[PDB]
């Protein structure tokens, strides 16, 4: 008898997604984004998405394809030059997406609430700010049933659970059952995204044996167990062009090429035809040839 073999292709995983889903995307800004899974989304007809993210070029690419209806985020950033994602900017200034922009800590809190199957968690962040106006009646307060020592009761933001239909995350190593690890200095929040979601897809740089996984990294880096994953995709360089812990840094030159290509119809159509219209292997081959000028 055997544990479930969850290995699937990029297209297989996106084949499990549906238009109208709420999808959380892991990583942070231009850091360990599941970019291969995002490119597989772009090739599909899945659209009308509600996206929950610490936004980077994942959200930009989805906006470039008109696939985003509503976005929950703490920021959108490319981290390095040119810093602002041009497609998010275009979607925003055109009013093409509804936003529930929020404080960065509120994203973590919302995912924690969903992970614990709670309808809300209280938080100070958001009070007194225009986060209240971004959300309107979708963001309410909750009053402590215990007053403070002064006799006054605190009224806090009731951060609602960020329940997800699906989570897309990219990690450095994993086995075929969904045990997975990060390498490098930060897990970001990918464990929380998986715990907040119904369907969980993890791409990894390399699929290894379980025993190989657990002898390669410290215990503390094993941030996904089998209960947190539904499909495992082997995607070497699958975070390109974002950084990926100890595996590789950010492809800064290509990120600049991505951003500049958004500026004109001819440049973007060329970027689409060259990088976004074939397989992941086609993309990786084209990125390799770009690197060699």
């Amino acid at each position: 008898v055997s544990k479930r073999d969850k290995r699937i292709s990029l297209d297989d995983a996106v084949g499990e997604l549906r238009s109208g889903m709420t999808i959380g995307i892991g990583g942070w800004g231009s850091r360990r984004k599941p970019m291969a899974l995002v490119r597989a989304l772009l090739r599909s007809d899945v659209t009308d998405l509600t996206v929950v993210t610490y936004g980077g070029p994942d959200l930009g690419l989805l906006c470039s394809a008109g696939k985003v209806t509503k976005a929950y985020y703490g920021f959108v950033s490319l981290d390095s030059a040119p810093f602002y994602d041009p497609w998010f900017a275009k979607a925003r200034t055109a009013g093409e997406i509804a936003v529930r922009e929020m404080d960065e800590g509120m994203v973590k809190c919302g995912l924690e609430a969903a992970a614990a199957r709670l309808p809300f968690l209280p938080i100070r962040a958001g009070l007194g700010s225009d986060v209240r106006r971004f959300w309107g009646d979708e963001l309410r307060t909750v009053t402590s049933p215990y007053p403070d020592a002064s006799g006054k009761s605190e009224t806090l933001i009731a951060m609602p659970a960020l329940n997800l239909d699906a989570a897309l995350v990219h990690l450095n190593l994993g086995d075929k059952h969904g045990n997975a690890a990060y390498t490098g200095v930060d897990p970001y929040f990918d464990d929380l995204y998986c715990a907040a979601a119904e369907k969980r897809f993890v791409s990894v740089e390399r699929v290894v044996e379980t025993e190989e996984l657990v002898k390669t990294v410290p215990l503390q880096n094993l941030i996904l167990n089998r209960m947190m994953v539904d499909g495992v995709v082997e995607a070497p360089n699958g975070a390109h062009f974002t950084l990926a812990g100890d595996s590789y840094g950010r492809d800064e030159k290509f990120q600049r090429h991505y951003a500049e290509s958004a500026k004109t119809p001819q440049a973007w159509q060329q970027f689409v035809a060259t990088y976004l219209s074939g397989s992941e292997d086609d993309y990786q081959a084209a990125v390799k040839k770009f690197a060699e000028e």
């Binding site: 404080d103 007194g128 403070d148 006054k152 605190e154």
Partner: protein
Amino acid sequence: TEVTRAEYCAIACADIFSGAGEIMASPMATLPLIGARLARLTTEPDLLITDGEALIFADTPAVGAKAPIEGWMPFRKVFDVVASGRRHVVMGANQIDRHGNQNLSAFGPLQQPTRQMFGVRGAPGNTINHPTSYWVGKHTSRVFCDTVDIVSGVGYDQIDPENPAYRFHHLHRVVSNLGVFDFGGPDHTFRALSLHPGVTADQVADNTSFEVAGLADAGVTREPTDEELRLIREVLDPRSLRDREVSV
């Protein structure tokens, strides 16, 4: 004395942390970063500082340099620090109003801005939880305006005095290329603490949309000590990166 405007800004940014004690200093721009590290090497050695990514520094390095580490501060743990209150952030700002409401999110309507930046980031959680200061490298009436487009940083006129959830709010300083300010004017309004040498009151008034409390009586920013000048010029910023972010 042959001190530049950028060097006055550096010691003014160090003075932000005077009396801070054993908290995380989170400067989000080059001048505040030189200031935080200058404070850490002079009068505030117990400040915690990071490499801006995930590592807590043991020693205090030059701008853009690595140093031996003393701990781990991934992003998820930063949010624990924020909620604990043991932090003083120095953020940039696209707009700051007379009561300290701040905008770094976007310009224009919330659901269809005219210009998009990063969004609110951590400004709402920062300003509601712990001391927050602002750095403005080019002091203008467009930055210091009557009304900000989007309140990403909480100002003093948002506070509900009946709700103790607001009790940790505290905007400590605004340092600009023209001087040092706080919100200690009447009704917690923008107030001049010092003007950097060579800056006139009229220059501040002409570049601020609203009245600056105490401007006519504000003195001149202090001289850096010889030790501060050595640390700025030899240890922390030998490559003059400070001058790139300070206007005139």
